[PDB]
């Protein structure tokens, strides 16, 4: 999975 660190982003995506 991916973890997104920034504004407006879904925090975790798979």
């Amino acid at each position: 999975c991916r973890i997104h660190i920034g504004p407006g982003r879904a925090f975790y995506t798979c």
Partner: antibody
Amino acid sequence: EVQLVESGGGLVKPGGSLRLTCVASGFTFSDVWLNWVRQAPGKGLEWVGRIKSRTDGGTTDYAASVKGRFTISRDDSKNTLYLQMNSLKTEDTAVYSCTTDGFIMIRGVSEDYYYYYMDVWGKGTTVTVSS
Amino acid sequence: QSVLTQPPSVSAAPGQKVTISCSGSSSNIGNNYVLWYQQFPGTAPKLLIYGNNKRPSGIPDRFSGSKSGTSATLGITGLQTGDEADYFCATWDSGLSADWVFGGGTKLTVLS
């Protein structure tokens, strides 16, 4: 050139409208989220709003100070970002710049991490609102 | 009245070290991650630190960052005359609109 170039700035009276354009060169424009920011004289940078990429829905978010007055849109075919400003106020006077979000990727064993930041920055265009 | 608060200026001589602080609230710095940028007059901002304390490619280890509570700090050691510039912090807000937010900037003078 790998760059963002804004145009359309000028003098407008309060209550009036103005559209800014921002043209991208040298990278895949459709892949990036874009922001508008502004900086008033003697003040610090303020974020105005964003528009996401088409793959992420193309939606827009706005600062509370401009909500309902400003609209951001994008035309991927023309590598162009727009800021439509309506009901302008004297306090909207500022240099307006566009930026892209970029990221730093860090691979992990089970998750990859993406850290976002404002990456490519335009030089700005000046908007003056005065009666 | 910038969202994040920085000292207007800091200074030290070549070879010395300085810190530049960034003060916010739980809705920004407290719960999110801090970036630092360097900006010379008439140039674009350049990223120095992301994720509170990480350095991107090409940034030397004499630049460092920390975060504590609702504050953050940029540290610069072995000052060079070429480091004289404005330095500003950034993060984002925890509301649904997720604004990017910025410090007012700090002018670093390398005393000459």
